[PDB]
Amino acid sequence: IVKNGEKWMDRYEIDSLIGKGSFGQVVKAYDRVEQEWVAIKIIKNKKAFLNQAQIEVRLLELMNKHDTEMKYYIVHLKRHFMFRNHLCLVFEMLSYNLYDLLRNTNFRGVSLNLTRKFAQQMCTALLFLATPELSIIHCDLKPENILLCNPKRSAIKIVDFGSSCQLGQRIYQYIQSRFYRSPEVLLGMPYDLAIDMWSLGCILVEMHTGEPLFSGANEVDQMNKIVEVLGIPPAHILDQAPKARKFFEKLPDGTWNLKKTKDYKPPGTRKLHNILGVETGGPGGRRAGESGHTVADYLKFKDLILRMLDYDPKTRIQPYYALQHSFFKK
Ligand SMILES: Cc1oc2ccc(-c3cc(N)nc(N)c3)cc2c1C
Ligand SMILES: [Cl-]
C-alpha cells in the first residue's frame, strides 16, 4: 500500500515493509527531525482495528509516564498520528525476534545461559507491567513478540500491546496465542496478570529445547498436552470454570478426570525433568558436558518453570519473586 520512497508530512521517508499482522503493517522509515530510523506501525483503516490500536496507544503512553525505571524492556512508543485515516504508531527500531532466533538454531534451542538472560529481562518487564497504577496484562506473549534490541547483543524488548488490557478492563474471553494460553483462559475464567507468567514459562522451555512446550492443534488438544505434563488441574479451580466440561468430567466424590476422546501419555507422566533432560545432558542430550549445563543448573531452571506453570493463578510465582529465584543467583 506504500511505495519504498514515499514522504509523509515533510518528516518520514518510507523505506520498506518489516512486519505485518491482523492490525496492518510495520514499515521502516527515516525521521528527518530526530535524524534516525524508526518503525511505523500502520493500523488498517477499519473501525475494529483503529479502536483496538487506540487502546494500545493509551497503554503505551501510560507506561511512558512511569519513568521511575524497570520500563526499559518494553518497546518505546515515540509518538502517534493519523495519516490517510490510518492510526500510525512510531517506535524505535529493534532487530529480529526470538522465533527467528530459534529458527536460526534449526529449532535446537539456545543455551541455558542465554535463556537465563532472556528470563531475567522478561521477569523485569512483567514486574514493571504489574506496578499497581499500570496493572497491564500483555495477553499475547510468545517468541515472535520479543525482539532483540541489536543483532550483536542479548538485550530484548516486548512488542505488540494490541491484545493488552488493564486489570478490570477485559474485553475478550478468548485471548493469548494457543501454545502460550494459560489454563484459566482455556477454562473461560476471569484472568489477571498471571496469564503472562504462564506464557513466559512456556516461552523459556521453548527457547532452550527449540520446540513449543504445549503445541495444541485446538483448545481440547492444548489442555490435553498441558495435562500430560502437569496432571489434572485442582478441583477448586475446575469447580469455578465455565469451560471445565470442554475438557474434564466430575465424578461422585468431587473428583475430575479427562474427558476421553477416540484414540496422550497419562496425566502428569510427561515429566518436565525429561523434556529438559536434567540428568541426561539437556534437550536430546545435546548439552552433554557443556559448561553452565550441570544437573544443579538444570534443577534451578526446572524449579522456576514449575513455579511459572502453577495451575493456580493466585499461587503462580509473581515477577518480583521470580527475580529472587536461585536460577538467577551467581
Ligand atoms: C524491526 C522492528 O522494530 C519494531 C518495533 C516495533 C514493532 C511493533 C510491532 C507491533 N505489532 N506492535 C508494536 N507495539 C510494535 C515491530 C518492529 C519490528 C519488526
Ligand atoms: Cl518434572
Query: What single string gives the DSSP state of each residue in 159-212?
Result: ---SS-EETT----SS-S-GGG--HHHHTT----THHHHHHHHHHHHHHHHSS-
- State the distance from the centre of ligand 2 to the C-alpha of 117, rounded, in angstroms: 22
Return the residue matching grid coordinates 500430560: 228
Name residues whose C-beta falls within 8 Å of residue 172's C-beta, 6 or more positions apart in sequence. Answer: 163
State the greatest distance between any 2 C-alpha atoms of the chain, in Å, as a whole number: 72
Cα end-to-end span (Å), the chain: 51
Strands 86-92 and 255-258: unpaired
What is the residue type of 276?
A: L
- 92 annotated as a binding-site residue: yes
Radius of gyration of the chain (CA): 21
Q: What amino acid is encoded at 159 in this protein? A: V
Q: Write out 254-317 in H/E/C secondary structure.
A: CEEEECCCCCCCCCCCCCHHHHCCCCCCCHHHCCCCCCCCCHHHHHHHHHHHHHHCCCCCCCCC
In this structure, the strands spanning 255-258 and 248-251 are: antiparallel
The answer to whether the Cα torsion of 266, 198, 107, 223 is positive or negative is positive
Is 41 annotated for ligand binding?
yes
User: Is 6 in contact with 14 (CB distance < 8 Å)?
Assistant: yes
How wide is the angle at C-alpha 16 spanned by C-alphas 122 and 163, nearest 5°? 35
CA-to-CA dists, residue 22 to 26, 41, 130, 257, angstroms: 11, 12, 27, 37
Strands 7-8 and 12-21: antiparallel
Is 291 annotated in a binding site? The answer is no
Method: X-ray
**Residue 282 annotated as binding site:** no
Whether the CB-CB separation of 179 and 214 falls below 8 Å is answered with: yes
Q: For a substitution probing ligand 1, which of 49, 75, 101 has the most ligand atoms within 8 Å of its CB? A: 75
Q: Residue 133 and residue 89: Cα distance in Å, rounded?
A: 23
Cell numbers describing residue 228: 500430560
Q: Which 3 state secondary structure label does DSSP give 249?
A: strand
Give the Cα separation of 97 and 210 in Å (integer). Answer: 14
Active-site hit among 140, 160, 192, 310: 140
Contact indicator for 313, 236 with CB cutoff of 8 Å: no
Q: How far is the CA of 111 from the centre of ligand 1 (A)?
A: 26
> Residue 195 and residue 309: Cα distance in Å, rounded?
10
Q: Are 319 and 196 in contact (CB under 8 A)?
A: no
Q: Which residue among 74, 93, 141, 147 is best mutated to probe the pocket of ligand 1, counting the most ligand atoms within 8 A of its Cβ?
A: 147
Task: Write down the domain spans for the chain.
Answer: 7-93, 97-326
- Calculate the alpha carbon distances from 186 to 15, 73, 128, 229, 242 in Å: 41, 28, 26, 16, 10
Q: Please give the single-letter amino acid code of residue 87.
A: L
Helix (H) or strand (E) holding 251: strand 248-251
Question: In this structure, which residue's CA is closest to atom 9 in ligand 1?
Answer: 160
* Cα of 229 vs its chain's centroid, Å: 20
For residue 36, give the C-alpha cell.
534516525
Give the angle 217-112-184 at the CA atoms, nearest 5°: 40
Output the CA–CA distances (angstroms, integers) from residue 90 to 27, 159, 186, in the order listed: 10, 12, 34
271 Cα to the center of ligand 1, angstroms: 36
Answer yes or no: is 167 a known binding residue.
Answer: no
- State this model's resolution in angstroms: 2.0
Residue 206: all three cell numbers together = 521453548
Place of cell 525505571: 69
**Ligand 1 neighbourhood includes 55 CB (under 6 angstroms):** no
Distance 29 CA to ligand 1 centre (A): 12
Q: How are the residues of the chain apportioned to helix, strand and coil, as percentages rounded to the nearest 5?
A: 35, 20, 45
Nearest of 249, 250, 203 to residue 97 by alpha carbon: 203
Q: Which fold has domain 7-93?
A: Phosphorylase Kinase; domain 1 (3.30.200)
Answer whether 7-93 and 97-326 agree in fold. Answer: no
User: Catalytic residue at 140?
Assistant: yes
Grid cell locating 7:
514522504
How far is 151 from 155, CA to CA, in rounded Å? 9
Which whole-number Å values give the CA distances from 16 to 2, 3, 25, 40, 75, in the listed order?
9, 8, 10, 10, 20
**The cell 548439552 sits on which residue?**
287
Q: What whole-number distance in Å separates Cα of residue 278 and Cα of residue 46?
A: 50
Contact 26, 40 (CB under 8 A): yes
Measure the CA–CA gap between 18 and 126, rounded to whole angstroms. 26
Residue 187 C-alpha from the chain's centroid? 19
Instruction: Count CB-CB contacts under 10 A for residue 232.
Output: 17
Atom index in ligand 1 nearest the CA of residue 92 equals 5
Whose CA is closest to 328, among 146, 110, 121?
121
- Starting from the CA of residue 145, give the closest ligand: 1
Give the ligand whose atoms come closest to the C-alpha of residue 23: 1
Please report how the helices 194-209 and 295-308 are oriented relative to each other, as an axis angle in degrees rounded to 10. 150
State whether CATH 1.10.510.10 applies to domain 97-326. yes
**Cβ atoms 95, 79 nearer than 8 A:** no
* Alpha carbon of 20 to ligand 1 centroid (Å): 9
